């Protein structure tokens, strides 16, 4: 290993449970600590430790194969996958938030106070008075209501920039990744 994976997992704990964070830190030794040896050292309940290890295994962080022999859980910390897993997690996340941004720009735009029946901007001809100028609802000629939200007045959002900034430590740590090792 190298400082890459050390700092990486150290900052990766920040997402999952801090109870999982202590267990991840126990990978300080790559010695592949066994489940019962972990009960001796981590001492978390066998059920709590089992749940925690399984949750840490599911996201492809670590891999375990207790053989048979007392049985010895083949604990691990698969670092080669770790980097790709974190990259895909942010890769999907950056996509989901940008799509949420763009998909939030569409709305009916109009309403009637009574009858609460949004129409569309396209209904202007039906929802209008040749004379009075105020847009009036079809089955209640008493509408005045314009837009509950006018439009994306602000820039894209503070949400996207907030993700950009709160993750600048993660971006910088993946810049420290910088492919230190060309191995498998």
């Amino acid at each position: 290993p190298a400082a890459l994976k050390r700092l990486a997992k150290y900052v990766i704990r920040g997402f999952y449970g801090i109870e999982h964070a202590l267990a991840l830190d126990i990978l300080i030794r790559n010695s592949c600590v066994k489940e019962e040896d972990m009960l001796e050292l981590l001492k978390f309940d066998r059920k709590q430790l089992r749940s925690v290890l399984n949750n840490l295994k599911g996201d492809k962080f670590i891999k375990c194969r207790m053989r048979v022999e007392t049985r010895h859980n083949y604990y691990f910390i698969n670092y080669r996958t770790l980097v790709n897993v974190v990259k895909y997690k942010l890769d999907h996340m950056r996509r989901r938030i940008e799509t949420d941004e763009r998909d939030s720009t569409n709305r009916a735009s109009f309403k009637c106070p009574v009858c609460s029946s949004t129409f569309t901007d396209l209904e202007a001809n039906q929802l209008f008075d040749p004379m009075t100028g105020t847009f009036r609802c079809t089955f209640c000629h008493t509408e005045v209501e314009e837009d509950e939200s006018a439009m994306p007045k602000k820039d894209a959002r503070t949400l996207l920039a907030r993700f950009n900034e709160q993750i600048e430590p993660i971006y910088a740590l993946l810049r420290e990744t910088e492919d230190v090792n060309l191995a498998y």
Partner: protein
């Protein structure tokens, strides 16, 4: 199931919940499944 996934509930909780969801859907499609329990109407009468 949606709330469990939202909260990040236990994997076994989600697994059993998905099992029950599958059972309910398959039972609604067909209540005469081979070697599986029958969904009653709280009165002993199997649902149609």
């Amino acid at each position: 199931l949606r709330r469990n996934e939202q909260n990040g509930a236990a994997a076994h909780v989600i697994a059993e919940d998905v099992k029950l969801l599958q059972f309910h859907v398959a039972t609604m499609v067909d209540n005469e499944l081979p070697g599986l329990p029958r969904a009653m109407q709280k009165s002993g009468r199997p649902l149609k």
